[PDB]
Recover the amino acids of this structure.
């Protein structure tokens, strides 16, 4: 009951953390190559706790000479679910994805090829620190909903890396672009002749992959053929040591939605179901920071699916769900901690916790504060240190 207001305030601080990071797939025109480039960061949960980050840089250039659509800057937003087929004995992965374009606030000939369900084949040959492997995958895509359903088999036996590290490499032409962004869909404009997709992926504190793929129609089927080379991986790191989680629970208790609704209400001060730049600004000032109008617009734009310039309740819930599913880096948890630890000493005092509360919404004269400190205070000093904070928040 005072643990309830940690959750509330914790979620709010986590929401502001989210709105200040860059989590989507960022796309920009590359006129020199008549294509596009992208960059983004992927988070892979480490089974025993922590996150393995994978930084991606990407380049796409058309295989043919027809004109292609070169986009304004925007992003793709991906939801992925990995599972296992219980009748499959081979090393494998079942993958369901939804991908939508956004990032531009309120139609090519190649888009015609994607109006129904299109079969897909994927073939990958890889070599990571000398361990070679192959993967084949098959399924279908339905661009109308930005949807993909595929099964992948390692045809060479055991995969020497974790399956989740290969998801990005294993057909963005299946993304759903909304009506007002059709002119930014490079991927389908290149079809049917297709495009070359190249990446380098840096796994932090570890090795990297370098990939080259050809994505084109062969007959009625959209085919993605890839080579991958990985080097400099550590034999006891998260990749070659198989320490990454396969299965993230797409949980969402009704309890969790209710707790997100509670944090949503700190931002949504007029109770209209949507967070405006004025509301988000109010909250951020009240926490000390002092952002311009432009920054507030960019923050909202990072999670604003419909492009209306506001974060509505369901867009907030989606954002909070992804933020809880994927582990934060140590730097990010430290930033959250700093919002409470105003003086920087490494310890949240009854006083510091009050300031943050007063300033954020809650009325709470000294008594309920004390109970909050006590609830989180493992070592008994009457203060909350980092490690106690980290435990409070899981
Ligand atoms: Ca509002
Ligand atoms: Ca919106
Ligand atoms: Ca302090
Ligand atoms: Ca303590």
């Amino acid at each position: 009951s005072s643990r309830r207001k940690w959750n509330k305030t914790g979620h709010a601080v986590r929401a502001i953390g989210r709105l200040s990071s860059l989590e989507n797939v960022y796309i920009k025109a590359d006129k020199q190559k008549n294509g596009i480039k992208a960059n983004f960061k992927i988070r892979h949960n480490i089974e025993d706790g922590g996150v393995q980050l994978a930084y991606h840089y990407q380049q796409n250039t058309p295989i043919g000479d027809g004109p292609v659509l070169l986009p304004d800057n925007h992003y793709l937003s991906v939801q992925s679910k990995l599972s296992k087929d219980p009748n499959e004995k081979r090393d494998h992965m079942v993958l369901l994805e939804f991908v939508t374009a956004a990032g531009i606030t309120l139609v090519s000939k190649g888009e015609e090829l994607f109006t129904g369900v299109v079969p897909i084949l994927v073939e990958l040959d890889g070599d990571v620190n000398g361990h070679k492997f192959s993967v084949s995958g098959e399924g279908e895509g339905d661009a109308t909903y930005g949807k993909l359903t595929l099964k992948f088999i390692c045809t060479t036996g055991k995969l020497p890396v974790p399956w989740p590290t290969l998801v990005t490499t294993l057909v963005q032409c299946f993304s759903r672009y909304p009506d007002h962004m059709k002119q930014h869909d490079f991927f389908k404009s290149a079809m049917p002749e297709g495009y070359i997709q190249e990446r380098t992926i840096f796994f932090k504190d570890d090795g990297n992959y370098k990939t080259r793929a050809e994505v084109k129609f062969e007959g009625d089927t959209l085919v993605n053929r890839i080579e991958l080379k990985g080097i400099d991986f550590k034999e006891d790191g998260n990749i070659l040591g198989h320490k990454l989680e396969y299965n993230l629970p797409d949980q969402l208790t009704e309890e969790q939605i209710a707790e997100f609704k509670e944090a949503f209400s700190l931002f949504d001060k007029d109770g209209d179901g949507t967070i405006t730049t004025k509301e988000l600004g109010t909250v951020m000032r009240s926490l000390g920071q002092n952002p311009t109008e432009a920054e507030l617009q960019d923050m909202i734009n990072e999670v604003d699916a419909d492009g209306d310039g506001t974060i509505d309740f369901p867009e907030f819930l989606t954002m909070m769900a992804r933020k809880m599913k994927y582990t934060d880096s140590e730097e990010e948890i430290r930033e959250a901690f700093r919002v409470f630890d105003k003086d920087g000493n490494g310890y949240i005092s009854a006083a510091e916790l009050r300031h943050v509360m007063t300033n954020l919404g809650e009325k709470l004269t000294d008594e309920e504060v004390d109970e909050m400190i006590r609830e989180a205070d493992i070592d008994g000093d009457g203060q909350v240190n980092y490690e106690e904070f980290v435990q409070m928040m899981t």
Notes: The chain is about 25% helix and 30% strand. The radius of gyration is 23 Å. The longest helix spans residues 3-19. The CA atoms of residues 174 and 319 lie 22 Å apart.
